[PDB]
Each structure stands twice: as structure tokens, then as C-alpha cells.
Nucleic acid binder design. Structure first.
Ligand SMILES: [K+]
Ligand SMILES: [Mg+2]
Ligand SMILES: [Mg+2]
Lengths: 21, 49, 56, 95, 92, 68, 144, 354, 49
RNA sequence: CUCGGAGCAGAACCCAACCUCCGAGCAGUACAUGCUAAGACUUCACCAGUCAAAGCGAACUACUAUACUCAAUUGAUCCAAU
């Protein structure tokens, strides 16, 4: 949740190369 | 209900009991105009009858 | 509305129970014969298409 | 609704109601589901089972149906082998 | 008292004791109980029918292979492995 | 009589059912086996083209179907 | 004149951790349907293959290891030409099956990946377990 | 509004500038291995382990057992490496391994396992079964003296007791044959307790067997402090744990306060707690060996209750909580007709005043 | 709670993602659990035969 | 002019304009898409709609197998056909 310190623990797309045709 | 009526003297077990005696004792109310065809004897109270 | 591809057909049990179920099939394919559960006999039996109910 | 008939000066029943709803003596009304015989080929088994259920009406609908039917339809009946006999009386109902 | 009862055949008495050993108490009395009805009459009738079923089953001597219950299936595997651990004496 | 006739009809029809199934299933396998054979043929017709792709890729297959 | 031995508590307390499991009434951890592997089991066979060794574990769903067999053990290593081949995996299955029976473990689930299941190593290890007496499926929980 | 993380966030140590040059997993198996490791580490956020993991005490479990044996690793490693070279030098061994026809001798493996890792596998298995929890209130020991217990069944067959295998009360109707390796002059105490049998007290045990001051491994010459009573797991009560505990005595001990009569058929006298028994004798007694089996009711248990214990047999049943239903409402809108049956006590017709 | 996310090996899309992740990187997701409140049942004395 | 997705409406739910954008009025695979039944959700009413443990019967000890893939993919009552 946004307000909580665990905000963004599930972020993953920054770890993968941008593959956008 | 039948045992209750007999205990209070409202129905006489010494004579045959039919609809006339049940009605005369005010034991049951029958409405022939409302498609009543008579009385059905139900088991409730069998243990103490 | 004009487009037409499939059709709804009645599948009747071959066990003689009279149990039927409806299925969808392509209009240009052959009549269906399916193995389907028949509750009357309580086991899977062959069903054969009899009639087309409507166009889907 | 006809509150006072021209011939008897009595309330009349809306017979459309009698053809669709079952009144249990405890006050509940039972009905079928709209569409339960419609387009079954496009409906899932779970949905079709829901549509086959006999369901109860709410308070407002029950009050309405009660007004649209005369007292005759609220009497206690003793039909022989009535399938709904058990449901005419409530049990363990609080408040 | 199952053993004393002379209205049941002796062979039937001995086969009921094995089949319904779990219903026979320390004194040897076969105890049946029914609580499925509001009326004592129906409860007694159920108990009496159980007695009649017990005598019928014992006399029938059915050899038909009944379908194995799920709880029994697990016990069968567990009994098989218990026999598999059984050993023999080195010097008998 | 009606009940006896319906039960007899089902019994008779249901005694034939086991043989009916083996025939049906055996023929379904053959139908599936006959589709696979047709698939192999198409692939062969493309090899006969020998990568000479273009507009004249559809009619070539038609010529060989006529031969079959 | 009551009998002292007949003083029995109205409720029986069985502290055996396996009691409800052995009666197939204990809860299994259902759920986790979007992740792998499932948690819906009491015991599971888990096989760890490394560059040099093969280890097989029987563990409770709570994460406690019950029994184990590894080629790191001298008892097994001394009889093996290689501790990393198909023979090693089959040997681990046979040794583990015996240890399972002695511990009372007759049932477990095995949760391989598709490539692991197809491998000859795991197929030989599974056959060793079933030949050894262990059943690699668990009985269904009884809810009623 | 934002709140700073309470600790290091996952995936923070990854350098995102050199993403193209960083090594990727490439395999499901390599990700899973790392994922399993991360799951086991402690975290500052809420976790499944926090709510479902057993709450172990932070202080380590006190070891109350015999000292570990002293080993020379250098000499051991030399002998082990030499044996492997000899095995691998043989050309038939290489061919059997390559052709997948080789096998291990299970009997020889177990013998070596008894002398090496066996003790630690038994400790791990006893911990899983809750024996240390129930017998010593969480204190543990490594059973370093292999204890072999077998019940004689018939005349040619034996039923061994390992560590949780099932033995029936009929098989255990008489005292088992017990053997262990003991030096001359050593004294030992063997006891059998039912952890789950007690019919009255939830935290109490039944003492089924107590032999004290055993000279060496001659169990038949020890003092019968409590005579053997076969297991009597009550019908419907599930599966019980019976544990044999072997104790090494430092000196001859006086067990007069633990002596039971012969025969002892009173369940109040058999009431026993291993923790209390060991606590008073801890200064002169050390746990050495352990064996246990699992037992369920069988038809021979009726004989124990009716004849030996002179009592009626208790029968138990597993009873489930009653099903939940929401409070019944006067108008159950849109609920099916069977809604009313959920709140009905009886199935037989009622007629009220009539 | 927050837990490590391991997809099923048959879920092609999710597996394609994790294989392309830098080594050392672990995906997390939010999970909801129910902590059972009551035991499955209790053993009760039913008879003294 | 009915239905669905996105923004407006940034974080539980809800939220309008002849506001800003994109779609739907199917298709495909099954033929147990069989039966039954706790407990719940719900488009702010009703109608309608949605998800389901256990159980029966199947399947099953290779199938992210158990209320099919799919976002919408749709039409009450009467009545008619059978
Ligand atoms: K107990
Ligand atoms: Mg609503
Ligand atoms: Mg189910």
C-alpha cells in the first residue's frame, strides 16, 4: 500500500529490459 | 388433543366416536364449504395416549 | 444478423431413455455422434444428432 | 386494485398474483426466477441451477402481494400430502 | 444377553458376537440404540429392525465382495507395510 | 405395461451399446488418422514448389489435388 | 462404590502430532493456487540434486524434516562408484524407502518439475520408493 | 503520503545501470533456488512464517545426553579417500554404474548408518514426534547407544521397534526383547511410557515398564521396578506414542520411591511423568538410547480393560464442531426454499395446538 | 503478508519473466491468508462398554 | 438511446456533462459446460447478475486435471411451437 513502508515491494519491471515494439 | 378431550369428559370413550361426537364436544371444527373432507388422525402424542 | 456459422442441434440418447441435450456444431460439418452422460441409465452412452433447433 | 366491487362492495384479488406466487401461512411468498426457461443453451450450469431455485420475496414485495390478495388466500390450509406443508411454520426464529 | 438368548440359533449367536463385538458390553449384553425420531414407538421399531437385520445378515452368509471404504484403503497399505517390517529370528 | 415396455426398450438398447461404442471410437480414431494423412500431403506439395514462391503458389497445389 | 480405574475424562487429549494426520482428518494447507509448489499435503518427498551429490528429504508441510538420505553420508557413499549418476539416485530411493517405513511414513506427495519428472533419474528414484513400500500419493482428507 | 522502509528493500543491491551486462537466471531451477533461500531469511515485514510457524523458544535446547564421541578427522578422511579410490579403480564397478545395473547393499548401509548419522536422524525424528517436548519439556539428547527392541510374535517371527513404526497391542502383549551394546560394570535403566494413553490427566503418562540397575546389557537381571503392562489405546482415541528410554547410570541407584507393586493394575499408580522421574535422578542418570512405536486400538485391548484392569472399556468418538449458519431472518430474500430447513430441529411433521 | 513469488513451471508467461531477471533478484507479491481459529474436532467419551 | 475497458475519479467503495479515448451484439475447445449443497458477493431499489467448500457421480496415480478459454459477446412477462 502506498502509505506503508512496504510500498513497491512487488516492483519488477525496472529489473527487466524495456521491450516495447 | 383426543386424550385431552377424553380426560375432560368432552368426548365419551364408552360409545363410538365419530365426526358428530367430535364436533359436539367442540374437539374439532370442520368446514365443508372450505373443501374439508373430515379429520385426519395424526400421531402427535402417541407416546402418552 | 446476416452472418451464419454454427447451428444448435438436439442430441438424443441411443439408450432409448429419451434424454436429450443441445449442442453447437459447425453448419458445414457432418452430423454429430457423441459420447455423453445419460442420467437415466447413469453412465456415458452414445448420442446422435436428430434435428436442428436454430441457427447460431 | 378493486377496493369495493360494484356487485358486492368487497375487495378483489389480483389474479395475476395467484398465478405466480405461493404464500406460506407464516407470511412468506415463494416465486420462481425470471428467465429460468429462456435461452438455456447460452447459460452455464451454475447459472441454470440458480434459475431453477424457488426463492423468497423481500418484506416490501411481501407487503405488496398481501395487499393484492384477499384474506381467503392467507388462511391455513391442510392439503393432503402438501409438498410445502413443512414450510408453513417458522422454527427458532428470534425477534 | 446375546449368549443366553435361545430364540436365536447358536451358530447365528456366534457370528453376531464377532460382527457386532463393538455393541456387546462387559456383561455380554448386545446394546442397540435409536434416537432418530421424536416418538418412542419409531425409535423402538428402529431398534427391533436392527435386531432382525443382524440375524438376517448372519444367516445369509453373503460372499459378495463389498466395495472397499476409503478409510479401509489406507489401513490396508499401513497393514501391508507393518508385515513388511516383520523379521525372523537369526537362529530359530 | 407401459413401464415394462420402456424398461425392456432401454435394456435391449443398452445391451447393444457396448458394441456400438467400440465401433464409434474405432471410427473416430480412423477419422483422426485420416486427417493426419491429409496434412502430410499438403506439406509434400509445398516441397514440390522448391521455394519458387510468389503468386503461383496456390494454384500449384490445386493441380496436384486433381491428379490425386 | 465407583471403580477408581473407571475415572475417565469426558474429553480425550491426544498430543501425538501425527494422530489427526493418521486419521486423515487433519487440515491440509489448501490455497496457494497461483504459486508453485502446492502446500496441500502432510508429507512431501523433496529431492535435491547438486553438482556432486543427490539428497532426498521427507518433510512435513510445517517444514520439519522427518527422514533423509544423502550420498554425502559415508554409509551410502562407500558403496557407490559415483554419487551423481542415475544409480546414485536409485540407491537414494531404496535407502529412503526403508527409513520411511521405520519412521512410520507410508504416504507422501512428490512435486517434480516437468523436466524432473521426465528424467530417468527421478523415474528410477520413484520406482525405488514405490517398490520399497511408500505410496507417492496421499489419501484425501475426510471432511465429514 | 509516504513512509520510508523499515529496512533494506528486496532487490536493492541490484545495480540497475549495468542491467544488460548483468547475469540472468536463464533457468527456472536457478530462480527457485534463490527464491527458496530468500523466503527462509528473516524479514521486517509481515510473513507467513510469522503467523503459521511454530513458536520455538529463542534459547537453545539444553542437551542432557552423553558426550559426543571423539574422532580423528585426518585419519578418517585418509581411510575414506583410500576406500573410494579402490572402489573406483575396479573396472566392473565402472561398468555397472555406466550400464545402470549397480546397487547398494541396504543391510550394510544401515549398519554403518547406525554408527554414524543414525543417532542424529533419531534425534531429528524424535523431535518431530514431540518426544522431547513431552518427556523432557523441550530438552533434547542424542541417542548415542543404539537400542534394539523387538516383540516376539509366534515363535519364528519378530516385530522390531524403530522410531514411529506401528505395532499392534496384540503384538506387544508381552515384554519385548531388548539388547544394546554395554561395557562390563555399566548400569542401565530401561522404561516404557505411553505418552498419549492417560485416560484422565491430559499431561500425564502411563508407566508400562521400568527395569532398573541393569548390569551391562543383561536386561533379564535388572530389578523389576514396574512390571510390564501391554499398551491399551482406547478405541476411537487415535494413535498413541509409546517410547522406550534407556538411561546410563553413573552408580547404583535406589528406586524405592518409584517401585510399583507386582502386579500393578491400578491406573492411578501407573500415572507417571518422565520429566519428574529424570529430574530427581539426573545427578546419577543420563539418557542414552531411545526407541518408540505407534499404537492404535485393537480387539486385544478389550481384554486388558475387562480382565487385567477390571473396568469397563472407554470408547471415544471424534466430534466435529456444529455447522455455522447466520442468524435467521424473518424475510430471507432471494434464498432458496431449503433455507428454512437449515434452522429446523426435527424432520417429522408438527401440528401445534391441533 | 508479502511473500516470494515462484510461478508454476507450466505458466509460460511468468516463467519467461523470471528467467530474464538478474541473478540475485527475487519477485514479491501480496498474499492473503486465513489463520484457522478452531480445531478440526475433539475426542469425546461416548460409551463405557 | 443497451453492454464492456481506460482517463476525468492519483490511495476502500461510489461519482456527472451533446466530456476525453478504445471496444462488444462473437469465436474456439469440450460433450460429467453432470447432480447436489455450506458460506458469501452484487453495479447503489427490484429484476437480473457473480464466486463457491463439503457431498454424489465421474476423471485420475504424465495433463498449473475439479464451476472450460474469453472483457463486453446481450432481451423480462404473456404468448407461440414441441
Ligand atoms: K491421553
Ligand atoms: Mg445491491
Ligand atoms: Mg468439491
Amino acid at each position: 500500500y502506498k502509505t506503508k513502508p512496504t510500498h513497491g515491494i512487488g516492483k519488477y519491471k525496472h529489473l527487466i529490459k524495456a521491450e516495447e515494439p | 388433543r383426543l386424550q385431552y378431550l377424553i380426560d375432560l369428559g368432552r368426548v365419551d370413550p364408552s360409545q363410538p366416536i365419530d365426526l358428530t361426537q367430535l364436533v359436539n364436544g367442540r374437539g374439532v371444527t370442520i368446514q365443508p364449504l372450505k373443501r374439508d373432507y373430515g379429520v385426519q388422525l395424526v400421531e402427535e402424542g402417541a407416546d402418552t395416549f | 444478423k446476416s452472418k451464419s456459422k454454427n447451428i444448435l442441434v438436439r442430441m438424443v440418447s441411443e439408450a432409448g431413455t429419451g434424454f436429450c441435450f443441445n449442442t453447437k456444431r459447425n453448419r458445414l460439418r457432418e452430423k454429430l455422434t457423441l459420447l455423453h452422460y445419460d442420467p437415466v441409465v447413469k453412465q456415458r452412452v452414445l448420442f446422435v444428432e436428430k434435428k436442428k433447433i436454430r441457427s447460431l | 386494485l378493486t377496493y369495493f366491487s360494484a356487485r358486492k362492495g368487497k375487495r378483489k384479488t389480483v389474479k395475476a398474483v395467484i398465478d405466480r406466487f405461493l404464500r406460506l401461512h407464516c407470511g412468506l411468498w415463494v416465486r420462481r426466477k425470471a428467465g429460468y426457461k429462456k435461452k438455456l443453451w447460452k447459460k452455464t450450469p451454475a447459472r441454470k441451477k440458480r434459475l431453477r431455485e424457488f426463492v423468497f420475496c423481500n418484506k416490501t414485495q411481501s407487503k405488496l402481494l398481501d395487499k393484492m390478495t384477499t384474506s381467503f388466500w392467507k388462511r391455513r390450509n391442510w392439503y393432503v400430502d402438501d409438498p410445502y406443508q413443512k414450510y408453513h411454520d417458522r422454527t427458532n426464529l428470534k425477534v | 444377553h446375546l449368549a443366553t438368548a435361545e430364540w436365536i440359533a447358536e451358530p447365528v449367536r456366534q457370528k453376531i458376537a464377532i460382527t457386532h463385538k463393538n455393541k456387546i458390553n462387559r456383561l455380554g449384553e448386545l446394546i442397540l440404540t435409536s434416537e432418530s425420531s421424536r416418538y418412542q414407538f419409531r425409535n423402538l421399531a428402529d431398534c427391533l429392525q436392527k435386531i432382525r437385520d443382524m440375524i438376517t445378515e448372519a444367516s445369509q452368509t453373503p460372499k459378495e465382495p463389498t466395495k472397499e471404504d476409503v478409510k479401509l484403503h489406507r489401513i490396508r497399505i499401513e497393514n501391508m507395510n507393518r508385515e513388511r517390517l516383520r523379521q525372523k529370528r537369526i537362529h530359530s | 405395461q407401459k413401464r415394462r415396455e420402456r424398461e425392456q426398450h432401454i435394456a435391449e438398447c443398452m445391451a447393444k451399446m457396448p458394441q456400438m461404442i467400440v465401433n464409434w471410437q474405432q471410427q473416430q480414431r480412423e477419422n483422426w488418422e485420416k486427417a493426419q494423412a491429409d496434412k502430410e500431403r499438403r506439406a509434400r506439395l509445398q516441397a514440390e514448389a522448391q521455394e519458387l514462391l510468389g503468386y503461383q503458389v496456390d494454384p500449384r497445389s490445386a493441380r496436384f489435388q486433381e491428379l490425386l | 462404590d465407583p471403580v477408581e480405574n473407571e475415572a475417565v475424562a469426558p474429553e480425550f487429549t491426544n498430543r501425538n502430532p501425527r494422530n489427526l494426520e493418521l486419521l486423515s482428518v487433519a487440515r491440509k494447507e489448501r490455497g496457494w493456487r497461483t504459486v508453485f509448489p502446492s502446500r496441500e499435503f502432510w508429507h512431501r518427498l523433496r529431492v535435491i540434486r547438486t553438482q556432486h551429490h543427490v539428497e532426498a528429504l521427507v518433510e512435513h508441510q510445517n517444514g520439519k524434516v522427518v527422514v533423509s538420505a544423502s550420498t554425502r553420508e559415508w554409509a551410502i557413499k562407500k558403496h557407490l562408484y559415483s554419487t551423481r549418476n542415475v544409480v546414485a539416485c536409485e540407491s537414494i530411493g531404496r535407502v529412503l524407502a526403508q527409513r520411511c517405513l521405520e519412521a512410520g511414513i507410508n504416504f507422501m506427495v512428490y512435486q517434480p518439475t516437468p523436466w524432473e519428472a521426465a528424467s530417468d533419474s527421478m523415474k528410477r528414484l520413484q520406482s525405488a520408493m514405490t517398490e520399497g513400500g511408500v505410496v507417492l500419493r496421499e489419501p484425501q482428507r475426510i471432511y465429514e | 503520503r509516504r513512509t520510508p522502509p523499515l529496512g533494506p528493500m528486496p532487490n536493492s543491491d541490484i545495480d540497475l545501470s549495468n542491467l544488460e551486462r548483468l547475469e540472468k537466471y536463464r533457468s527456472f531451477d536457478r530462480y527457485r533456488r534463490r527464491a527458496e533461500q530468500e523466503a527462509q531469511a528473516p524479514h521486517w515485514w509481515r510473513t507467513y512464517r510469522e503467523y503459521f510457524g511454530e513458536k520455538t523458544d529463542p534459547k537453545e535446547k539444553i542437551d542432557i545426553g552423553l558426550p559426543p564421541p571423539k574422532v580423528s578427522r585426518t585419519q578418517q578422511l585418509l581411510e575414506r579417500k583410500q576406500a573410494i579410490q579402490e572402489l573406483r579403480a575396479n573396472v566392473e564397478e565402472e561398468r555397472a554404474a555406466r550400464l545402470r545395473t549397480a546397487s547398494v547393499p541396504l543391510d550394510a548401509v544401515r549398519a554403518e548408518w547406525e554408527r554414524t548419522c543414525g543417532p542424529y536422524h533419531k534425534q531429528r525424528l524424535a523431535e518431530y514426534y514431540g518426544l522431547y517436548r513431552d518427556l523432557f519439556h523441550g530438552a533434547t539428547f542424542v541417542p548415542r547407544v543404539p537400542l534394539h527392541v523387538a516383540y516376539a510374535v509366534g515363535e519364528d517371527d519378530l516385530m522390531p521397534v524403530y522410531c514411529g513404526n506401528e505395532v499392534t497391542p496384540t503384538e506387544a502383549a508381552q515384554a519385548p526383547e531388548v539388547t544394546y551394546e554395554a561395557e562390563e560394570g555399566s548400569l542401565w535403566t530401561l522404561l516404557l511410557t505411553s505418552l498419549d494413553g492417560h485416560l484422565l490427566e491430559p499431561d500425564a503418562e502411563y508407566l508400562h515398564w521400568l527395569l532398573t540397575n541393569i548390569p551391562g546389557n543383561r536386561v533379564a537381571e535388572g530389578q523389576v521396578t514396574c512390571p510390564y503392562l501391554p499398551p491399551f489405546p482406547a478405541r476411537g482415541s487415535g494413535i498413541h506414542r509409546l517410547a522406550f528410554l534407556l538411561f546410563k547410570q553413573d552408580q547404583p541407584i535406589d528406586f524405592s520411591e518409584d517401585a510399583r507393586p507386582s502386579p500393578c493394575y491400578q491406573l492411578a499408580q501407573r500415572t507417571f511423568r518422565t520429566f519428574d522421574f529424570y529430574k530427581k535422578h539426573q545427578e546419577t542418570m543420563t539418557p542414552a538410547g531411545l526407541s518408540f512405536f505407534q499404537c492404535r486400538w485393537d480387539d486385544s485391548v478389550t481384554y486388558i480393560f475387562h480382565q487385567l484392569l477390571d473396568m469397563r472399556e472407554p470408547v471415544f468418538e471424534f466430534v466435529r464442531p456444529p455447522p455455522y449458519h447466520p442468524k435467521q431472518k424473518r424475510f430471507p430474500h432471494r434464498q432458496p426454499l431449503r433455507y428454512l430447513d437449515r434452522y429446523r430441529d426435527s424432520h417429522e411433521p408438527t401440528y401445534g395446538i391441533y | 503478508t508479502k511473500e516470494v513469488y515462484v510461478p508454476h513451471p507450466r505458466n509460460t508467461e511468468a516463467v519467461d519473466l523470471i528467467t530474464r531477471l538478474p541473478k540475485g533478484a527475487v519477485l514479491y507479491k501480496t498474499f492473503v491468508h486465513v489463520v484457522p481459529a478452531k480445531p478440526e474436532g475433539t475426542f469425546k467419551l461416548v460409551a463405557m462398554l
